[PDB]
C-alpha cells in the first residue's frame, strides 16, 4: 500500500523492487505483463516517481528480449554462426548480472537512492540497446550462415564514430565469424568442405562447371571482392 | 509549504520530471522570496529538455548520417556528467538550501546554455554541413566556451576525417548517405563533382580541390591504367600529392605515363 506510505521512504522501496525488475524476476510493485515487453507500475504512486521509473524500464524490456534470443538461437537448426553470435552475446548478459549484484550489495547500506540508480545504469542502458537491435535485425530477415555475417559488418560500419558502440559490434563480429572462418581454412589449404548445415558460400554436388557452385546469398559482403578466387 | 519541500521538487525539475509543474516552470501558498528563486532554478531544467529532445528525436530516424551520430553521441558524454552532479546534490538533501543551490549550479547554467543553443543553430544540417556549423561556434573568444565547443568539434570531425583518409590513400569512397563533398556518378571529365554544400568550414576552397584530385588520381590509376599498389594536416595533403601524381606519370610514360601519351599523341595523331 504505497499510497498510505510516506514519500521519502517509499522511494527506497521502489529502488529495491526496481533492481529485481532489471534481473527480470517479477517484482512486488513493478510487475510485468504477458507479451516489446510492457510493464505496469501502480495506479496510486507519486507523479514525480513513475515518470522517473518509466525511464529506467527500457533496460528491462531490452533485456527480456535478449535473454529470449539466447535461450532460442542456440538450437541446432540454425548453423555454426547463429550459435557463436548467441554465445558471445551471453558473456555480456553475465556482465550485466554482476552490475546488478554490486547494486544489491551497495543498497543494503542505504547508499542507493533512486536518483543514484538513474546514473549507474547509463552504460548498461546503452549496451542492452545494441544487443536488442541485432536480435531484432537477425530475425526480421531470416539470416543464417553468411547473411548473418554481412549484417554484423554493416551494423559495425554505421557506428564509425561512436567508439562506445563500435568496440562492441566489433566484439560480436570478431566472435561470430570464427566458425565460418574455420571451414574456410579447410577450403583453402585443402579441398574438403564439411559445412554440415547448408551455410558456406561454396556447396558441392554429385563436367566440372557443375560440381562446385558459388552460392549468392551466403557471401559475407566483405569477401565480395574475392568471391571468385575462393572457389 | 516548507523550504525543504521545494528543494525536493527542484532536484527533479532539473531533469524534466515535475508543486513545480510545466514554457516557464510555473510554480503554484508560499512567500514571494521563494517563488522567484524557484522560477530561475526550475527554468534550468526546461533547458535540459530542449537538449534532450534533439538527442532523442534524431536518435530515432536512420537517415541522419554518420556525422549526425558522432554529434548526437557526443551530446551524451556531456550529459552523463550532468547526471553525476544530480547524483551528488541528491545525497545531501537528506543540508543544502535554495541560496546554496545558486552557487552549486551556477556553472552548469552555462554549459546547459551553449549546448541548448548549439542544437538550434544546426537543425537541418546533416553530413559535413553539420561539422561546419558546429565550427562556427569557435569564433567566440570566451575561454570557457571556446574550450568546450572546440572539443565537440574534435568528435564531430572524426567521421569527416575518416572519409578523407579513405578517399586519399585508397580512393574508395563509400557513403550511402551523401555526406562527403566528393559525389560520384554511376574517367576524368565526369563521375567526380566538388559538392559546394558539404565542404567543412575548416578546409579552404583550394584544399578541397587537392583531395578531389588525389582521389581521382588513384581511382583512375586502378581501373583504366590497370595497375594496383592545423599545419601537419596541410602537409599531409601535399605529401599525398607530390607522390601520387609523380607516380601517375611514371606509369603513363613507361607502360604507355600521362606524359608519354602526350608525346606519342603528337607523333601519330599530329
Amino acid at each position: 500500500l504505497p499510497g498510505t506510505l510516506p514519500l521519502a521512504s517509499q522511494e527506497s522501496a521502489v529502488v529495491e523492487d526496481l533492481l529485481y525488475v532489471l534481473v527480470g524476476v517479477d517484482g512486488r510493485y513493478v510487475s510485468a505483463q504477458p507479451l516489446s515487453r510492457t510493464f505496469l507500475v501502480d495506479p496510486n504512486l507519486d507523479l514525480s516517481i513513475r515518470e522517473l521509473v518509466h525511464r529506467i524500464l527500457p533496460v528491462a524490456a531490452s533485456y527480456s528480449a535478449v535473454t529470449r534470443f539466447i535461450e532460442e538461437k542456440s538450437s541446432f537448426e540454425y548453423g555454426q554462426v547463429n550459435h557463436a553470435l548467441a554465445a558471445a552475446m551471453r558473456t555480456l548478459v553475465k556482465e550485466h548480472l554482476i552490475l546488478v549484484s554490486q547494486l544489491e550489495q551497495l543498497h543494503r547500506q542505504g547508499l542507493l537512492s533512486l536518483q543514484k540508480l538513474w546514473f549507474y545504469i547509463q552504460p548498461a542502458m546503452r549496451t542492452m540497446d545494441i544487443l536488442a537491435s541485432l536480435a531484432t535485425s537477425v530475425d526480421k530477415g531470416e539470416c543464417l550462415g553468411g547473411s548473418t555475417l554481412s549484417l554484423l559488418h554493416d551494423r559495425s560500419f554505421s557506428y564509425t564514430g561512436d567508439s562506445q558502440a563500435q568496440e562492441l559490434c566489433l566484439y560480436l563480429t570478431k566472435a561470430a565469424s570464427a566458425p565460418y572462418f574455420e571451414v574456410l581454412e579447410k577450403w583453402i589449404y585443402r579441398g574438403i568442405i564439411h559445412d554440415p548445415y547448408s551455410e558456406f558460400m561454396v556447396e558441392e554436388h554429385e563436367y566440372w562447371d557443375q560440381r562446385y557452385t558459388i552460392v549468392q546469398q551466403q557471401i559475407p559482403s566483405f569477401l565480395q571482392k574475392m568471391a571468385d578466387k575462393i572457389l | 509549504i516548507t523550504e525543504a519541500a521545494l528543494v525536493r521538487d527542484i532536484l527533479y525539475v532539473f531533469q524534466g520530471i515535475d508543486n513545480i509543474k510545466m514554457n516557464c516552470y510555473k510554480v503554484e501558498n508560499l512567500s514571494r522570496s521563494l517563488r522567484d528563486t524557484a522560477v530561475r532554478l526550475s527554468e534550468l531544467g526546461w533547458l535540459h529538455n530542449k537538449i534532450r529532445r534533439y538527442t532523442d528525436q534524431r536518435s530515432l530516424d536512420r537517415s541522419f548520417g554518420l556525422v549526425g551520430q558522432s554529434f548526437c553521441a557526443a551530446l551524451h558524454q556531456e550529459l552523463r556528467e550532468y547526471y553525476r552532479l544530480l547524483s551528488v546534490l541528491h545525497s545531501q538533501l537528506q543540508s543544502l538550501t535554495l541560496r546554496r543551490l545558486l552557487v552549486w549550479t551556477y556553472d552548469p547554467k552555462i554549459r546547459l546554455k551553449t549546448l541548448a543553443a548549439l542544437v538550434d543553430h544546426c537543425q537541418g544540417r546533416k553530413g559535413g554541413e553539420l561539422a561546419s556549423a558546429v565550427h562556427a561556434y569557435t569564433k567566440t573568444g570566451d575561454p570557457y566556451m571556446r574550450s568546450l565547443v572546440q572539443h565537440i568539434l574534435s568528435l564531430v570531425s572524426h567521421p569527416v576525417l575518416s572519409f578523407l583518409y579513405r578517399w586519399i590513400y585508397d580512393g574508395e569512397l563509400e557513403d550511402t548517405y551523401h555526406e562527403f563533398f566528393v559525389a560520384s556518378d554511376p574517367l576524368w571529365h565526369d563521375k567526380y563533382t566538388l559538392r559546394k554544400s558539404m565542404i567543412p568550414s575548416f578546409m579552404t576552397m583550394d584544399q578541397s580541390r587537392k583531395v578531389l584530385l588525389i582521389g581521382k588520381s588513384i581511382n583512375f590509376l586502378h581501373q583504366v591504367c590497370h595497375d594496383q599498389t592545423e599545419n601537419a594536416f596541410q602537409g599531409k595533403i601535399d605529401a599525398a600529392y607530390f607522390e601520387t601524381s609523380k607516380y601517375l606519370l611514371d606509369v603513363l610514360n613507361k607502360k604507355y605515363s600521362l606524359l608519354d601519351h602526350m608525346q606519342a599523341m603528337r607523333r601519330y595523331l599530329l
Side-chain angles (χ1 to χ4, degrees), chain B residues 157-181:
Chain B
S157 68
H158 172 49
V160 172
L161 292 176
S162 158
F163 303 146
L164 207 64
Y165 283 173
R166 217 181 172 200
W167 177 244
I168 277 185
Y169 296 102
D170 288 349
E172 52 178 3
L173 78 161
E174 163 78 3
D175 47 319
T176 80
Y177 299 99
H178 299 97
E179 299 178 321
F180 209 49
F181 50 87

PDB file of all heavy atoms in Angstrom, chain B residues 157-181:
ATOM      1  N   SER B 157      34.172  15.987 -36.146  1.00  0.00           N
ATOM      2  CA  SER B 157      35.038  15.961 -37.311  1.00  0.00           C
ATOM      3  C   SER B 157      35.899  14.709 -37.377  1.00  0.00           C
ATOM      4  O   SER B 157      36.891  14.695 -38.111  1.00  0.00           O
ATOM      5  CB  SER B 157      35.930  17.195 -37.334  1.00  0.00           C
ATOM      6  OG  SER B 157      36.862  17.144 -36.273  1.00  0.00           O
ATOM      7  N   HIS B 158      35.570  13.676 -36.613  1.00  0.00           N
ATOM      8  CA  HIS B 158      36.298  12.422 -36.767  1.00  0.00           C
ATOM      9  C   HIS B 158      35.758  11.599 -37.934  1.00  0.00           C
ATOM     10  O   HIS B 158      36.555  11.042 -38.696  1.00  0.00           O
ATOM     11  CB  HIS B 158      36.266  11.587 -35.489  1.00  0.00           C
ATOM     12  CG  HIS B 158      36.835  10.216 -35.667  1.00  0.00           C
ATOM     13  ND1 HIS B 158      38.053   9.992 -36.269  1.00  0.00           N
ATOM     14  CD2 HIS B 158      36.349   8.997 -35.332  1.00  0.00           C
ATOM     15  CE1 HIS B 158      38.297   8.695 -36.292  1.00  0.00           C
ATOM     16  NE2 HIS B 158      37.279   8.068 -35.732  1.00  0.00           N
ATOM     17  N   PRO B 159      34.438  11.463 -38.111  1.00  0.00           N
ATOM     18  CA  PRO B 159      33.966  10.771 -39.316  1.00  0.00           C
ATOM     19  C   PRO B 159      34.357  11.472 -40.603  1.00  0.00           C
ATOM     20  O   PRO B 159      34.670  10.796 -41.590  1.00  0.00           O
ATOM     21  CB  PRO B 159      32.442  10.728 -39.129  1.00  0.00           C
ATOM     22  CG  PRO B 159      32.145  11.677 -38.054  1.00  0.00           C
ATOM     23  CD  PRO B 159      33.331  11.693 -37.170  1.00  0.00           C
ATOM     24  N   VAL B 160      34.357  12.805 -40.630  1.00  0.00           N
ATOM     25  CA  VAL B 160      34.774  13.513 -41.837  1.00  0.00           C
ATOM     26  C   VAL B 160      36.217  13.171 -42.173  1.00  0.00           C
ATOM     27  O   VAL B 160      36.540  12.826 -43.315  1.00  0.00           O
ATOM     28  CB  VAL B 160      34.579  15.029 -41.678  1.00  0.00           C
ATOM     29  CG1 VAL B 160      35.201  15.744 -42.846  1.00  0.00           C
ATOM     30  CG2 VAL B 160      33.110  15.358 -41.606  1.00  0.00           C
ATOM     31  N   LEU B 161      37.092  13.231 -41.190  1.00  0.00           N
ATOM     32  CA  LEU B 161      38.456  12.801 -41.462  1.00  0.00           C
ATOM     33  C   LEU B 161      38.585  11.307 -41.569  1.00  0.00           C
ATOM     34  O   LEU B 161      39.714  10.815 -41.629  1.00  0.00           O
ATOM     35  CB  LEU B 161      39.404  13.332 -40.390  1.00  0.00           C
ATOM     36  CG  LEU B 161      39.589  14.844 -40.405  1.00  0.00           C
ATOM     37  CD1 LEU B 161      40.467  15.280 -39.259  1.00  0.00           C
ATOM     38  CD2 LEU B 161      40.190  15.276 -41.716  1.00  0.00           C
ATOM     39  N   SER B 162      37.494  10.548 -41.575  1.00  0.00           N
ATOM     40  CA  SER B 162      37.578   9.129 -41.886  1.00  0.00           C
ATOM     41  C   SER B 162      37.365   8.869 -43.368  1.00  0.00           C
ATOM     42  O   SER B 162      38.034   8.007 -43.942  1.00  0.00           O
ATOM     43  CB  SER B 162      36.559   8.336 -41.071  1.00  0.00           C
ATOM     44  OG  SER B 162      36.268   7.103 -41.699  1.00  0.00           O
ATOM     45  N   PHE B 163      36.439   9.592 -44.000  1.00  0.00           N
ATOM     46  CA  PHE B 163      36.323   9.503 -45.451  1.00  0.00           C
ATOM     47  C   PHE B 163      37.567  10.061 -46.124  1.00  0.00           C
ATOM     48  O   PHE B 163      38.083   9.474 -47.080  1.00  0.00           O
ATOM     49  CB  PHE B 163      35.090  10.258 -45.939  1.00  0.00           C
ATOM     50  CG  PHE B 163      33.807   9.796 -45.332  1.00  0.00           C
ATOM     51  CD1 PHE B 163      32.792  10.699 -45.076  1.00  0.00           C
ATOM     52  CD2 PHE B 163      33.602   8.469 -45.030  1.00  0.00           C
ATOM     53  CE1 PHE B 163      31.606  10.292 -44.524  1.00  0.00           C
ATOM     54  CE2 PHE B 163      32.413   8.055 -44.478  1.00  0.00           C
ATOM     55  CZ  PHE B 163      31.415   8.968 -44.226  1.00  0.00           C
ATOM     56  N   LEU B 164      38.064  11.196 -45.630  1.00  0.00           N
ATOM     57  CA  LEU B 164      39.193  11.863 -46.265  1.00  0.00           C
ATOM     58  C   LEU B 164      40.419  10.966 -46.288  1.00  0.00           C
ATOM     59  O   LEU B 164      41.079  10.828 -47.321  1.00  0.00           O
ATOM     60  CB  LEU B 164      39.503  13.166 -45.534  1.00  0.00           C
ATOM     61  CG  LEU B 164      40.156  14.253 -46.367  1.00  0.00           C
ATOM     62  CD1 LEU B 164      39.203  14.680 -47.446  1.00  0.00           C
ATOM     63  CD2 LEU B 164      40.521  15.426 -45.491  1.00  0.00           C
ATOM     64  N   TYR B 165      40.744  10.345 -45.159  1.00  0.00           N
ATOM     65  CA  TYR B 165      41.872   9.426 -45.147  1.00  0.00           C
ATOM     66  C   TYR B 165      41.581   8.131 -45.885  1.00  0.00           C
ATOM     67  O   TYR B 165      42.480   7.293 -46.010  1.00  0.00           O
ATOM     68  CB  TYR B 165      42.292   9.123 -43.712  1.00  0.00           C
ATOM     69  CG  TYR B 165      43.089  10.232 -43.074  1.00  0.00           C
ATOM     70  CD1 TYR B 165      43.421  10.188 -41.733  1.00  0.00           C
ATOM     71  CD2 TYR B 165      43.509  11.322 -43.817  1.00  0.00           C
ATOM     72  CE1 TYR B 165      44.146  11.198 -41.149  1.00  0.00           C
ATOM     73  CE2 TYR B 165      44.237  12.338 -43.241  1.00  0.00           C
ATOM     74  CZ  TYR B 165      44.553  12.269 -41.905  1.00  0.00           C
ATOM     75  OH  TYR B 165      45.278  13.280 -41.322  1.00  0.00           O
ATOM     76  N   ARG B 166      40.356   7.945 -46.363  1.00  0.00           N
ATOM     77  CA  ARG B 166      39.990   6.810 -47.197  1.00  0.00           C
ATOM     78  C   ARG B 166      40.014   7.152 -48.679  1.00  0.00           C
ATOM     79  O   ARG B 166      40.538   6.379 -49.483  1.00  0.00           O
ATOM     80  CB  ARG B 166      38.596   6.318 -46.807  1.00  0.00           C
ATOM     81  CG  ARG B 166      38.409   4.822 -46.851  1.00  0.00           C
ATOM     82  CD  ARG B 166      36.984   4.469 -46.476  1.00  0.00           C
ATOM     83  NE  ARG B 166      36.687   3.059 -46.688  1.00  0.00           N
ATOM     84  CZ  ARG B 166      35.457   2.570 -46.801  1.00  0.00           C
ATOM     85  NH1 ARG B 166      34.414   3.384 -46.725  1.00  0.00           N
ATOM     86  NH2 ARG B 166      35.270   1.273 -46.995  1.00  0.00           N
ATOM     87  N   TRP B 167      39.489   8.340 -49.001  1.00  0.00           N
ATOM     88  CA  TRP B 167      39.385   8.855 -50.393  1.00  0.00           C
ATOM     89  C   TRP B 167      40.714   9.462 -50.866  1.00  0.00           C
ATOM     90  O   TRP B 167      40.735  10.016 -51.969  1.00  0.00           O
ATOM     91  CB  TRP B 167      38.229   9.862 -50.494  1.00  0.00           C
ATOM     92  CG  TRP B 167      38.081  10.498 -51.842  1.00  0.00           C
ATOM     93  CD1 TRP B 167      38.224  11.821 -52.147  1.00  0.00           C
ATOM     94  CD2 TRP B 167      37.774   9.834 -53.080  1.00  0.00           C
ATOM     95  NE1 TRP B 167      38.020  12.026 -53.486  1.00  0.00           N
ATOM     96  CE2 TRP B 167      37.741  10.825 -54.085  1.00  0.00           C
ATOM     97  CE3 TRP B 167      37.520   8.506 -53.439  1.00  0.00           C
ATOM     98  CZ2 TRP B 167      37.467  10.527 -55.418  1.00  0.00           C
ATOM     99  CZ3 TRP B 167      37.247   8.211 -54.756  1.00  0.00           C
ATOM    100  CH2 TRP B 167      37.222   9.210 -55.730  1.00  0.00           C
ATOM    101  N   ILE B 168      41.772   9.367 -50.058  1.00  0.00           N
ATOM    102  CA  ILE B 168      43.081   9.879 -50.427  1.00  0.00           C
ATOM    103  C   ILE B 168      44.093   8.759 -50.614  1.00  0.00           C
ATOM    104  O   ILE B 168      44.862   8.773 -51.575  1.00  0.00           O
ATOM    105  CB  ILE B 168      43.582  10.898 -49.383  1.00  0.00           C
ATOM    106  CG1 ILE B 168      42.994  12.269 -49.662  1.00  0.00           C
ATOM    107  CG2 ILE B 168      45.087  10.972 -49.385  1.00  0.00           C
ATOM    108  CD1 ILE B 168      43.540  13.328 -48.754  1.00  0.00           C
ATOM    109  N   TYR B 169      44.111   7.782 -49.714  1.00  0.00           N
ATOM    110  CA  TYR B 169      45.095   6.714 -49.791  1.00  0.00           C
ATOM    111  C   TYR B 169      44.585   5.477 -50.514  1.00  0.00           C
ATOM    112  O   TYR B 169      45.399   4.674 -50.983  1.00  0.00           O
ATOM    113  CB  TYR B 169      45.556   6.323 -48.387  1.00  0.00           C
ATOM    114  CG  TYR B 169      46.279   7.428 -47.657  1.00  0.00           C
ATOM    115  CD1 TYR B 169      45.640   8.181 -46.684  1.00  0.00           C
ATOM    116  CD2 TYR B 169      47.607   7.718 -47.938  1.00  0.00           C
ATOM    117  CE1 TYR B 169      46.299   9.189 -46.016  1.00  0.00           C
ATOM    118  CE2 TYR B 169      48.274   8.725 -47.274  1.00  0.00           C
ATOM    119  CZ  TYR B 169      47.616   9.456 -46.314  1.00  0.00           C
ATOM    120  OH  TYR B 169      48.278  10.460 -45.652  1.00  0.00           O
ATOM    121  N   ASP B 170      43.269   5.304 -50.618  1.00  0.00           N
ATOM    122  CA  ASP B 170      42.691   4.150 -51.290  1.00  0.00           C
ATOM    123  C   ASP B 170      41.718   4.505 -52.399  1.00  0.00           C
ATOM    124  O   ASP B 170      41.453   3.655 -53.251  1.00  0.00           O
ATOM    125  CB  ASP B 170      41.971   3.246 -50.279  1.00  0.00           C
ATOM    126  CG  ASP B 170      42.932   2.493 -49.389  1.00  0.00           C
ATOM    127  OD1 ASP B 170      44.145   2.504 -49.682  1.00  0.00           O
ATOM    128  OD2 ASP B 170      42.477   1.889 -48.394  1.00  0.00           O
ATOM    129  N   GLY B 171      41.174   5.717 -52.410  1.00  0.00           N
ATOM    130  CA  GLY B 171      40.296   6.121 -53.488  1.00  0.00           C
ATOM    131  C   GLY B 171      38.994   5.362 -53.559  1.00  0.00           C
ATOM    132  O   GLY B 171      38.398   5.272 -54.633  1.00  0.00           O
ATOM    133  N   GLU B 172      38.533   4.813 -52.440  1.00  0.00           N
ATOM    134  CA  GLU B 172      37.290   4.051 -52.386  1.00  0.00           C
ATOM    135  C   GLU B 172      36.312   4.776 -51.467  1.00  0.00           C
ATOM    136  O   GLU B 172      36.198   4.467 -50.280  1.00  0.00           O
ATOM    137  CB  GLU B 172      37.560   2.615 -51.920  1.00  0.00           C
ATOM    138  CG  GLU B 172      38.364   2.498 -50.629  1.00  0.00           C
ATOM    139  CD  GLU B 172      38.567   1.063 -50.193  1.00  0.00           C
ATOM    140  OE1 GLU B 172      38.128   0.153 -50.925  1.00  0.00           O
ATOM    141  OE2 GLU B 172      39.153   0.847 -49.113  1.00  0.00           O
ATOM    142  N   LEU B 173      35.587   5.741 -52.014  1.00  0.00           N
ATOM    143  CA  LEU B 173      34.589   6.443 -51.227  1.00  0.00           C
ATOM    144  C   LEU B 173      33.344   5.577 -51.114  1.00  0.00           C
ATOM    145  O   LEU B 173      32.934   4.924 -52.076  1.00  0.00           O
ATOM    146  CB  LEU B 173      34.232   7.796 -51.839  1.00  0.00           C
ATOM    147  CG  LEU B 173      33.293   7.823 -53.040  1.00  0.00           C
ATOM    148  CD1 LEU B 173      32.700   9.199 -53.188  1.00  0.00           C
ATOM    149  CD2 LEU B 173      34.019   7.424 -54.302  1.00  0.00           C
ATOM    150  N   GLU B 174      32.755   5.559 -49.921  1.00  0.00           N
ATOM    151  CA  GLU B 174      31.566   4.753 -49.670  1.00  0.00           C
ATOM    152  C   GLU B 174      30.735   5.474 -48.621  1.00  0.00           C
ATOM    153  O   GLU B 174      31.136   5.544 -47.456  1.00  0.00           O
ATOM    154  CB  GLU B 174      31.936   3.348 -49.211  1.00  0.00           C
ATOM    155  CG  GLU B 174      30.805   2.589 -48.538  1.00  0.00           C
ATOM    156  CD  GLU B 174      29.796   2.032 -49.527  1.00  0.00           C
ATOM    157  OE1 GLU B 174      30.008   2.181 -50.748  1.00  0.00           O
ATOM    158  OE2 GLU B 174      28.789   1.443 -49.080  1.00  0.00           O
ATOM    159  N   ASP B 175      29.599   6.021 -49.039  1.00  0.00           N
ATOM    160  CA  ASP B 175      28.677   6.672 -48.112  1.00  0.00           C
ATOM    161  C   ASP B 175      27.287   6.593 -48.733  1.00  0.00           C
ATOM    162  O   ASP B 175      26.968   7.364 -49.644  1.00  0.00           O
ATOM    163  CB  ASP B 175      29.090   8.109 -47.837  1.00  0.00           C
ATOM    164  CG  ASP B 175      29.429   8.866 -49.097  1.00  0.00           C
ATOM    165  OD1 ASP B 175      30.083   8.276 -49.977  1.00  0.00           O
ATOM    166  OD2 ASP B 175      29.031  10.042 -49.213  1.00  0.00           O
ATOM    167  N   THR B 176      26.476   5.653 -48.247  1.00  0.00           N
ATOM    168  CA  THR B 176      25.109   5.534 -48.743  1.00  0.00           C
ATOM    169  C   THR B 176      24.367   6.852 -48.598  1.00  0.00           C
ATOM    170  O   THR B 176      23.646   7.274 -49.509  1.00  0.00           O
ATOM    171  CB  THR B 176      24.375   4.425 -47.995  1.00  0.00           C
ATOM    172  OG1 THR B 176      23.940   4.918 -46.723  1.00  0.00           O
ATOM    173  CG2 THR B 176      25.299   3.239 -47.778  1.00  0.00           C
ATOM    174  N   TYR B 177      24.535   7.516 -47.463  1.00  0.00           N
ATOM    175  CA  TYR B 177      24.070   8.880 -47.295  1.00  0.00           C
ATOM    176  C   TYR B 177      25.115   9.831 -47.854  1.00  0.00           C
ATOM    177  O   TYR B 177      26.317   9.611 -47.695  1.00  0.00           O
ATOM    178  CB  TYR B 177      23.812   9.180 -45.822  1.00  0.00           C
ATOM    179  CG  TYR B 177      22.761   8.290 -45.223  1.00  0.00           C
ATOM    180  CD1 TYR B 177      23.110   7.176 -44.476  1.00  0.00           C
ATOM    181  CD2 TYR B 177      21.418   8.560 -45.412  1.00  0.00           C
ATOM    182  CE1 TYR B 177      22.146   6.360 -43.929  1.00  0.00           C
ATOM    183  CE2 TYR B 177      20.449   7.750 -44.873  1.00  0.00           C
ATOM    184  CZ  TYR B 177      20.816   6.652 -44.132  1.00  0.00           C
ATOM    185  OH  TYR B 177      19.842   5.848 -43.591  1.00  0.00           O
ATOM    186  N   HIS B 178      24.654  10.877 -48.524  1.00  0.00           N
ATOM    187  CA  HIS B 178      25.558  11.799 -49.203  1.00  0.00           C
ATOM    188  C   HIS B 178      26.100  12.791 -48.185  1.00  0.00           C
ATOM    189  O   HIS B 178      25.432  13.764 -47.832  1.00  0.00           O
ATOM    190  CB  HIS B 178      24.842  12.489 -50.353  1.00  0.00           C
ATOM    191  CG  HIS B 178      24.352  11.543 -51.404  1.00  0.00           C
ATOM    192  ND1 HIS B 178      23.055  11.080 -51.441  1.00  0.00           N
ATOM    193  CD2 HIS B 178      24.991  10.957 -52.444  1.00  0.00           C
ATOM    194  CE1 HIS B 178      22.914  10.258 -52.466  1.00  0.00           C
ATOM    195  NE2 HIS B 178      24.074  10.166 -53.091  1.00  0.00           N
ATOM    196  N   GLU B 179      27.313  12.535 -47.701  1.00  0.00           N
ATOM    197  CA  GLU B 179      27.983  13.401 -46.739  1.00  0.00           C
ATOM    198  C   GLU B 179      29.271  13.986 -47.285  1.00  0.00           C
ATOM    199  O   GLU B 179      29.461  15.207 -47.252  1.00  0.00           O
ATOM    200  CB  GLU B 179      28.284  12.624 -45.452  1.00  0.00           C
ATOM    201  CG  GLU B 179      27.063  12.099 -44.745  1.00  0.00           C
ATOM    202  CD  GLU B 179      27.425  11.316 -43.512  1.00  0.00           C
ATOM    203  OE1 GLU B 179      28.431  10.579 -43.555  1.00  0.00           O
ATOM    204  OE2 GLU B 179      26.716  11.444 -42.495  1.00  0.00           O
ATOM    205  N   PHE B 180      30.168  13.142 -47.778  1.00  0.00           N
ATOM    206  CA  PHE B 180      31.429  13.602 -48.333  1.00  0.00           C
ATOM    207  C   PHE B 180      31.177  14.570 -49.478  1.00  0.00           C
ATOM    208  O   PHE B 180      30.183  14.463 -50.201  1.00  0.00           O
ATOM    209  CB  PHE B 180      32.236  12.399 -48.810  1.00  0.00           C
ATOM    210  CG  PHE B 180      33.710  12.593 -48.751  1.00  0.00           C
ATOM    211  CD1 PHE B 180      34.308  13.078 -47.610  1.00  0.00           C
ATOM    212  CD2 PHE B 180      34.508  12.227 -49.811  1.00  0.00           C
ATOM    213  CE1 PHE B 180      35.668  13.240 -47.543  1.00  0.00           C
ATOM    214  CE2 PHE B 180      35.869  12.383 -49.747  1.00  0.00           C
ATOM    215  CZ  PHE B 180      36.450  12.887 -48.611  1.00  0.00           C
ATOM    216  N   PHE B 181      32.076  15.536 -49.635  1.00  0.00           N
ATOM    217  CA  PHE B 181      31.908  16.550 -50.666  1.00  0.00           C
ATOM    218  C   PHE B 181      32.346  16.084 -52.046  1.00  0.00           C
ATOM    219  O   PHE B 181      32.314  16.883 -52.984  1.00  0.00           O
ATOM    220  CB  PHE B 181      32.673  17.818 -50.288  1.00  0.00           C
ATOM    221  CG  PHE B 181      34.089  17.572 -49.891  1.00  0.00           C
ATOM    222  CD1 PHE B 181      35.086  17.520 -50.840  1.00  0.00           C
ATOM    223  CD2 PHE B 181      34.428  17.392 -48.564  1.00  0.00           C
ATOM    224  CE1 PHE B 181      36.386  17.295 -50.476  1.00  0.00           C
ATOM    225  CE2 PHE B 181      35.729  17.164 -48.197  1.00  0.00           C
ATOM    226  CZ  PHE B 181      36.710  17.116 -49.155  1.00  0.00           C
TER     227      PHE B 181
END
